[PDB]
Amino acid sequence: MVMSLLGHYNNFFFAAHLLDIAMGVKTLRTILSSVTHNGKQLVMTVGLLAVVVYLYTVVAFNFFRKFYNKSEDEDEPDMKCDDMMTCYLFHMYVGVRAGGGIGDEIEDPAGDEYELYRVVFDITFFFFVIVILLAIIQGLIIDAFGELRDQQEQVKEDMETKCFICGIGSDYFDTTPHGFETHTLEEHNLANYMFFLMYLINKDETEHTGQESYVWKMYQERCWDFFPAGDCFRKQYEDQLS
């Protein structure tokens, strides 16, 4: 509302609306649900990126100072390792976005001093931070899709097998023909009960039968004994009258 209101300042600020208004769609909201399932771990991974790139920044602060220079001829008034903040900025702005480590953004280390020292620093930086941590991020959202799908499969299986009310699977309700569907529909079905409660609330206290008054008593007591929870009219009457 307010962003629409302040868009009357002759400005673009309507245009930041649609972004999280697409959440009103179903499927995109499901996707964003997946990615937000794990965002905390993504954030602490980014903190680990911060500490690591910080920890690498010193290693050229105090040893490799004659390299981070942009090779303008006759002079370098630009050298992003003197100030520490500028070097941390340099790595976190350029070295991570290079796609290839720093090695496209340095002097050539083939000078004799500390050459192998620099090269191991480059490659271990490259390897560790880029491939392992971007892969961590990728694997997190990948596992997110897998996890939500596992949830859906799990609920569908557990709901299909059982009556939801007793703990009884469909094996007992298939000794008769087609019986699980009758059980979950004709017998206790978790929609008749809602109509029953609406009926009981919308009927006055004087005319309830003993069953209905008993159940209202139990409802106001907030005991749930009336639900069977293990025996539904047929194990009771198995041997007698099936």
């Binding site: 192998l116 020292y117 090269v119 191991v120 490659i123």
Partner: peptide
């Protein structure tokens, strides 16, 4: 830990625990 003979004769302990060739 000695440039040319670095991984070999300069430090064999870490060279055996791992197998690097640039430290």
């Amino acid at each position: 830990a000695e440039g040319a003979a670095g991984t070999v004769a300069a430090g064999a302990t870490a060279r055996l625990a791992a197998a690097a060739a640039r430290a």
